[PDB]
Design a protein around this ligand. Structure first.
Ligand SMILES: [Mg+2]
Ligand SMILES: [Mg+2]
Ligand SMILES: [Mg+2]
Ligand SMILES: [Mg+2]
Ligand SMILES: [Mg+2]
Ligand SMILES: [Mg+2]
Ligand SMILES: [Mg+2]
Ligand SMILES: [Mg+2]
Ligand SMILES: [Mg+2]
Ligand SMILES: [Mg+2]
Ligand SMILES: [Mg+2]
Ligand SMILES: [Mg+2]
Ligand SMILES: [Mg+2]
Ligand SMILES: [Mg+2]
Ligand SMILES: [Mg+2]
Ligand SMILES: [Mg+2]
Ligand SMILES: [Zn+2]
Length: 92
RNA sequence: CAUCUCAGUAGGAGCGGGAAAAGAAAUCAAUUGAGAUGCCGUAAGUAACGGCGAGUGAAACCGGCACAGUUCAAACCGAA
RNA sequence: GGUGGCAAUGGCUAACCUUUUAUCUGGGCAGCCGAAGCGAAAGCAACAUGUGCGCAGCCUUUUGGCGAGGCACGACGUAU
RNA sequence: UCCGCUGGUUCCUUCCGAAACAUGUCGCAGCAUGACCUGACUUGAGAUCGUCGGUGGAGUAGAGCACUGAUUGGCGAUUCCGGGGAUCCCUCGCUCGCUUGUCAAACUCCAAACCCCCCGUCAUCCUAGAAAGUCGGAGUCCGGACUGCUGGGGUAAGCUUGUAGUCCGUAAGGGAGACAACCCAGCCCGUGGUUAAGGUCCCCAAGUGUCGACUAAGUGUUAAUACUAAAGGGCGU
RNA sequence: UGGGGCCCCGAAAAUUGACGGGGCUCAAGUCGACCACCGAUACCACGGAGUACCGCAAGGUAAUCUCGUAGGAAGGCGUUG
RNA sequence: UACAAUCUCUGAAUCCUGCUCAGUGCAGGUACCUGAAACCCCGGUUCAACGGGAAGAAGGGCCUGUAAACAGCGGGGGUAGACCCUCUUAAGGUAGCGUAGUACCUUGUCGCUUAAUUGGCGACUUGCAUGAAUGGAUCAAUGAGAGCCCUACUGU
RNA sequence: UUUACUGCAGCCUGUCGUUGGGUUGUGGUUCUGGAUGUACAGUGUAGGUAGGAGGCAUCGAAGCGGGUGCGCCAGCAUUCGUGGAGCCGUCCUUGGGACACUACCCUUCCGGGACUACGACCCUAACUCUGAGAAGAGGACCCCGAUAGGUGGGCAGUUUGCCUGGGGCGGGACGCCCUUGAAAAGAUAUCAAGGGCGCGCAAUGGUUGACUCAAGCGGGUCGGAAACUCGCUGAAGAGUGCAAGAGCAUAAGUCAGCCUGACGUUAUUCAGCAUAGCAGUGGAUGACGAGACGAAAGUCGGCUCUAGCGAACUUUUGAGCCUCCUUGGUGGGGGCCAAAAAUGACAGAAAAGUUACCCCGGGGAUAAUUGAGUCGUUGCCGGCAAGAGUACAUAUCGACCCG
RNA sequence: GAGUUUGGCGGCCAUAGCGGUAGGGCAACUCCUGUACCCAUCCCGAACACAGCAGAUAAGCCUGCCCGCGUUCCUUACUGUACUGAAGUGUGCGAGCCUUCGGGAACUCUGGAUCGCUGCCAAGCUCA
């Protein structure tokens, strides 16, 4: 499973066909100031705590490949529905 | 079913009267106003909370009943 | 749902007062629903009839005509 | 306290009258939504339970080997891919063609009778309101049986699981010895009359009826039916 | 020799006993036909009740209305105030 | 007040008590790795929230001891059933006992006990699935314990 | 009961308070004696840097010492002297820094004194134990209050599904796709039969052009009955990524050229889920905006058609906007639209056992076995007789098959 | 204005295909002659492209015929047979089957047919 580093595809902002650069979308780290974290602080007391003592869930046999297509003119990225592959070479 | 709900309920300890508790803004408002407290009506099953599930859940503005404001500490005198 | 009062100049009052003992008569516009919608929000803001088919009913040569309500369009407000 | 689990729930008549099924469910003794029942209202002209003819859909029964898999011998050769016992001395199965004998639920060159959509016609319903629409109230999701489908499974079963019609459930009255669902019949009350199913020696209403033969075993005197014995033999008749 | 109808052998179960029973032999059995009669709340006639729909009422139409469980709807009776 | 208290296993006497520290448990060591908050350092915030760094307690990893701690003591096929090999994921049953209160096959085979015994006792034993303080073997006296046999007695 | 899920006591340890006075090793905090500042040296020591230089000097300035701040035993300071001139640099040691007094505000130097935090030691007056008390023994440790991390069936609250020819065991007929069952429209069950899927591919994708594949027959060199080539027959007997079924010949197949439509946004209808409600999500027609190939017509919303997948809440990412309570700004939150992260019990609980010590409510809606149905099996017979019986099927025994 | 022949684009898609055989080219098609040019070969002017006079009906195309295989149709028998819709107090120990009214094959058999029908337009002609 390869895919070119660059190719020519419609840019939804420029509304024209021109080169794009493909890259990998890396999952960030959850911050501590969102309201879920504040709720987790407010709900920690004595004993059980509901959602925040849930065991972590399982996983699926193969995840999707999450990619971001960034234009080379306006530098504005856009995302597309992603396929599912095990080994993903990124064939420039 | 574990947070939640049942519910500050059932139950317990203390104190206490014909009533008790509260009570004279370090308040509520919004551009500018009101002027102690209690109780009833409404705001309203709204805002808000919540495995944002089941459920829980106000107040201010406004209309009434009844109306009431004051006393110490200190600065000055020093037993008056 | 069946039966009623009032009716866009809309409908109803709640607590309470007049109670002359719980009735009753007259007040009580706070407030709730209706009157403008769309949208998460900021915000913006529509036909007081333009056309056709046609039931009831009425007119008529008994065949056609007018045709409330009904149905189908057209036009417009807002969100995307 | 709570339960989807067990028992009970009090007067009369009148009009209409089901489902024991599909999907979701920590669902299988429960519930929701739909099908099916009932009441009211709006609208205002058609509807199709049935017949005949035509334009179309067939791929089941049956039939057959033209494809796919099997299958029986004879004949002629594969001068192979093959097993028997240095010119592979020569035997020769598998295989390819012509003829004979069988097959198929996942085969088809063929191909019905039922059945389905639509058009026309007849016929029935309909302004005393067709088709369609809106709102209120439910019950029900333990079913069973008979006649067909050589239904599927199973040695078979009053077994288990499907499907079309009609029934019991909720169906009186008449006849089957009695018989949930078998035959006649779908039922307001009273009187008279004629018939259906079935019967007519006595029990028991009506034939010791008619015509032509058979049986000698008390065989039989038993529509269907979960209730009725087979292969084989008989110079029995 | 072949094809048919009926019957016989093949054919043994436990309380006493099941063509419904008595019984039945040119039949009161089997096969093919036929005639007459009996026999329902079915069908016909008369009278009566109710219901559905229409009509101002009087009344009119009903071969095409009268079964019924779960259940829906309508009108009435009774007890105490 | 250690000839004590508390906590466990086994169960008089007699002959004895084998091998295994892989698993789990316990104790000690913590070289090294991991390991929260507070304090400290940097970035951030006209201040905070917040993000990294250093350091590093108990505990864990890692190492050592411990079986009268909880526990374990295996296959087959060569060879008069030996013994060289095995399968050895720590080791592969020592003394004893053995068809058992444990032996499925099973009413195992032989002897004593009866005319005749799925019985009792003795012997063998390839032990489905015996075994040493999960105590092994045997044992005089005792037993309202559980089996079998002899004698006397009797209406069982 | 436990190495089920979630917690709570008990115990072990860090930090804060109670909590004091000294010994010193720590590091800056904080403070002096010199700009200490100095390689291409120096007549000069970059008196940081620097008005790229002008005031000092027998009215104090030099070369030298162990060497005076310090460093290159050079030398700016005048210090203990020593000679009795280093002046600025427009002679810049023409500079890493090129240098002059009222500036050294600042490499630094660092009695590091100073409050602080750490590791160890000492003291008594807090505090603790003993005693009627004097007093004795410990001692800023321990106990105690708070907080953080561990161990923790000692104890508590719960979960441990369903289908099923009774339950269990086995399995998953618990989500999706094809053929038969299925009775020639549609629908149709069983732990019914045959099965498959939880993927792979920058080419194995799009378009245009040129062609025809499987297998045989005839010929050519050891190119052996195993190779490549020429001619003929060849509607498909091949290939089309993967199951089954269907489709395809001037092609939906094979090869070459050019490309990335494996595009952003949006509306209906169909099936999932006949008739007849039900997510998400897929597949067929379209619409707007951009393209590829081709003379054009046209084809292209991946790989010929039907499988290859998941709601709400939550976090993360992309474009642009809306918003936070009298007003304006900064940091930080909340919202709208799409994509990714998973619930396989697949229309979506954070989840193990035992009860013969058991308790309760129901069930013949569902089992031991009494009954009823069936007869595979079991007991008992029959038909044909193959053969044996010294000859002779039937004195006697009786095969195979059938009832 | 009717007909014939030739040429192009087609409808039904084997009654049209397979094989065999005898005839024709005047107008038309074809075969057929070469590679300057646009164009081409995974090599080849083979093909495609261009340029076109010669000769030929031996091939394509056209007309006539052949039952020799395959396909389509009719008739005789099989046969109102197999199968089947509706009703049945008809029948079998059983798996099953029978009567009435209504539908109705497949193969095989005797004998015949089928060697395509047809739409639009143009050109050469052939008439009044
Ligand atoms: Mg008192
Ligand atoms: Mg007060
Ligand atoms: Mg509360
Ligand atoms: Mg058949
Ligand atoms: Mg129910
Ligand atoms: Mg019936
Ligand atoms: Mg009925
Ligand atoms: Mg009856
Ligand atoms: Mg009722
Ligand atoms: Mg030992
Ligand atoms: Mg005995
Ligand atoms: Mg517990
Ligand atoms: Mg509870
Ligand atoms: Mg179960
Ligand atoms: Mg016990
Ligand atoms: Mg009980
Ligand atoms: Zn762009």
């Amino acid at each position: 499973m390869k895919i070119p580093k660059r190719f020519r595809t419609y840019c939804p902002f420029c509304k024209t066909h021109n080169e794009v650069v493909v890259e990998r979308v890396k999952k960030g780290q959850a911050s501590s100031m969102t309201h879920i974290a504040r709720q987790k602080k407010r709900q920690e007391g004595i004993g059980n705590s509901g959602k925040f003592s849930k065991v972590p869930g399982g996983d699926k046999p193969t995840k999707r490949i999450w990619l971001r297509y960034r234009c080379t003119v306006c530098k504005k990225a856009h995302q597309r529905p992603c396929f599912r592959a095990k080994k993903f070479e990124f064939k420039e």
